Amino acid sequence: DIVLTQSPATLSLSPGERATLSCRASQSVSSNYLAWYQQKPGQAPRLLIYDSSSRATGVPARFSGSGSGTDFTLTISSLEPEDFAVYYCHQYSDISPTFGQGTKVEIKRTVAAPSVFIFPPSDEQLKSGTASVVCLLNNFYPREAKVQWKVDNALQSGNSQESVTEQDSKDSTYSLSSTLTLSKADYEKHKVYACEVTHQGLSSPVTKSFNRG
Amino acid sequence: VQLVESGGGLVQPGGSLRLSCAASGFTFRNSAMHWVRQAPGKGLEWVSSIWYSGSNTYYADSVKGRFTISRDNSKNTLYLQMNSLRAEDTAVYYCARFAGGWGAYDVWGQGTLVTVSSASTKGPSVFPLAPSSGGTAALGCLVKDYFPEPVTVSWNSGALTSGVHTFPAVLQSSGLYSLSSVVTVPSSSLGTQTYICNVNHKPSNTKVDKKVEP
Numbered sequence: 001d002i003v004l005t006q007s008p009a010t011l012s013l014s015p016g017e018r019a020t021l022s023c024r025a026s027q028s029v030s031s032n033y034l035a036w037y038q039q040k041p042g043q044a045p046r047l048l049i050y051d052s053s054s055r056a057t058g059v060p061a062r063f064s065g066s067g068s069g070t071d072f073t074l075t076i077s078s079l080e081p082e083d084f085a086v087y088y089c090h091q092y093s094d095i096s097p098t099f100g101q102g103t104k105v106e107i108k109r110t111v112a113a114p115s116v117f118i119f120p121p122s123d124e125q126l127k128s129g130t131a132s133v134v135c136l137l138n139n140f141y142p143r144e145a146k147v148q149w150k151v152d153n154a155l156q157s158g159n160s161q162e163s164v165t166e167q168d169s170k171d172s173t174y175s176l177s178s179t180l181t182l183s184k185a186d187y188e189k190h191k192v193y194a195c196e197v198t199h200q201g202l203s204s205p206v207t208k209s210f211n212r213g
Numbered sequence: 214v215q216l217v218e219s220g221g222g223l224v225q226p227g228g229s230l231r232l233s234c235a236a237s238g239f240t241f242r243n244s245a246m247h248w249v250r251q252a253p254g255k256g257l258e259w260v261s262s263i264w265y266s267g268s269n270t271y272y273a274d275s276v277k278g279r280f281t282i283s284r285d286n287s288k289n290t291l292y293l294q295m296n297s298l299r300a301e302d303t304a305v306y307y308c309a310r311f312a313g314g315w316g317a318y319d320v321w322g323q324g325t326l327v328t329v330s331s332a333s334t335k336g337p338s339v340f341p342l343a344p345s346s347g348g349t350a351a352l353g354c355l356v357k358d359y360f361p362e363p364v365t366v367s368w369n370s371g372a373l374t375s376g377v378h379t380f381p382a383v384l385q386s387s388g389l390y391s392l393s394s395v396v397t398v399p400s401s402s403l404g405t406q407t408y409i410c411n412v413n414h415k416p417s418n419t420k421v422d423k424k425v426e427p
Contacts, residue, residue: 035317050317055301076355088257092317095271097259117351122340163380177393181257
């Protein structure tokens with residue numbers, strides 16, 4: 001199989017700056033049969049480059065592709081606002097076409113610590129047998145944040161899910177919900193519910209908590 | 214040039230589905246045609262290929278034996294017959310024209326979503342996210358346990374929009390979806406201002422208005 005590895009996972013850059021994206025293959029891609037696509041949320045992929053370095057019709061000259069063998073790179077000489085998107089590489093050199101797992105090009109911004117809020121489950125839900133505890137991290141940058149759940153100070157694992165918004169159209173920050181699902185019995189069995197948040201904008205972890213009752 | 218896929222939708226595990234793709238703006242008979250899919254939150258994955266010159270079907274290992282790719286050139290249409298469907302075949306399905314050294318995937322359809330699940334239609338439960346005691350508060354609504362997507366949420370019937378974050382749905386371990394919508398407010402307006410989330414789940418015809426109290 002030909003495994004395609006894209007680096008970095010995320011590129012954080014400001015408009016006007018150069019973007020350099022890498023695609024490396026587990027084996028030589030015959031004839032440099034390698035393409036690059038752009039994808040915006042909810043939209044279909046769009047060809048940029050094919051055969052390693054040919055520009056697709058009507059694609060801006062600021063997009064260029066290079067490399068050969070197993071090492072390929074997509075250059076966007078200067079990011080325009082419409083260029084912040086996810087980018088995929090794709091080999092079509094054998095009978096088993098493969099894709100890299102993508103590089104997200106996101107707008108660089110000032111570090112912004114999140115505002116953190118924690119919500120207990122409602123009394124109405126509890127009578128139904130479940131407790132959802134919700135922690136909100138609001139308009140932060142960068143996107144990387146560690147959110148820990150602690151119940152009576154015991155770290156939780158496997159019982160929360162995260163959800164994140166797209167970079168804010170106006171302020172380029174993210175917001176994130178973390179949700180903890182407990183049984184009513186487990187919820188009622190403990191007192192302290194804490195959301196622990198680690199982020200670049202915080203010198204020290206921020207803890208938001210409540211006591212059940 | 215254009216590609217329009219159709220036929221995606223809700224199918225139970227082990228069920229079957231035929232996707233079609235109508236092509237225009239190019240000589241269909243002269244082009245190899247492929248299927249490419251995108252699972253939720255995931256990247257692109259090639260699914261299957263069919264030649265033009267004397268067709269030669271190829272398929273991803275995960276679909277070999279279960280999917281069949283075909284074409285009707287009199288109808289300028291590409292097909293994907295999907296049998297024995299699995300949860301992990303849930304994805305947006307793209308048809309694409311394959312031009313190889315003249316262009317790779319130079320033409321893409323809009324995508325058609327195929328969702329594979331044993332889950333039956335269910336309207337959500339909506340629970341308040343209650344504000345409590347710098348000068349700013351957050352509140353919202355937990356919209357939990359619905360199927361299928363989507364749900365829509367507004368605040369105060371449209372009138373409250375600053376500070377609103379309605380997060381994307383997540384698929385819970387129950388196979389039911391869940392989402393939260395939150396708003397940051399001045400703490401002082403609490404008890405004074407009335408806040409209501411308006412929640413609509415069309416697939417079950419579910420409509421709730423829930424006042425989130427302090």
